Amino acid sequence: IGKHVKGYHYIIANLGFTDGDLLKIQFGGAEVSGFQIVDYDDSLVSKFIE
Amino acid sequence: TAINVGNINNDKKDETYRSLFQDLELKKERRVILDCERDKVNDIVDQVITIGKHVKGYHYIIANLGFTDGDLLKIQFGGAEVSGFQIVDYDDSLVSKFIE
Numbered sequence: 094i095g096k097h098v099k100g101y102h103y104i105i106a107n108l109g110f111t112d113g114d115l116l117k118i119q120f121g122g123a124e125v126s127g128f129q130i131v132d133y134d135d136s137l138v139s140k141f142i143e
Numbered sequence: 144t145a146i147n148v149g150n151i152n153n154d155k156k157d158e159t160y161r162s163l164f165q166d167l168e169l170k171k172e173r174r175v176i177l178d179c180e181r182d183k184v185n186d187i188v189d190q191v192i193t194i195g196k197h198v199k200g201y202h203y204i205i206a207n208l209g210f211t212d213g214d215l216l217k218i219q220f221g222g223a224e225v226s227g228f229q230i231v232d233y234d235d236s237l238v239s240k241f242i243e
Contacts, residue, residue: 094220094221094222095192095195095197095198095220095221095222097195098195098198099195117193119193120161120193120194120195121193121194121195122194122195123195
């Protein structure tokens with residue numbers, strides 16, 4: 094329906110932001126904010142992901 | 144505002160396409176004609192949805208004899224007007240006996 098252009102702004106209310114597919118609205122223009130509890134930038138998770 | 148969309152590799156396709164509509168944003172272009180092969184249409188249509196240039200305000204013209212031969216249900220609910228051309232009439236009894 095096209096409600097993700099510049100003007101809308103969504104909030105993802107779960108501790109898993111990067112756990113789902115999120116590239117789909119990566120260029121729509123709308124702003125998206127969420128939460129991550131599993132910081133994939135932390136050193137222990139990087140050795141875990143490998 | 145004729146733009147040669149032909150010369151593009153598949154590697155940098157997403158970068159030159161957003162840059163093509165940030166160049167179509169200089170003119171605030173809301174009326175576009177495609178006039179391409181049916182394969183290159185669905186690639187253009189897809190990147191359009193991702194940037195959001197299909198809501199109420201845009202109007203595209205598909206210049207090829209295959210309007211319904213591609214997928215149109217994706218840009219059916221955005222709000223923009225889309226036009227095209229069809230030579231195969233699916234309401235004729237000759238094509239019905241062929242489709243059956």
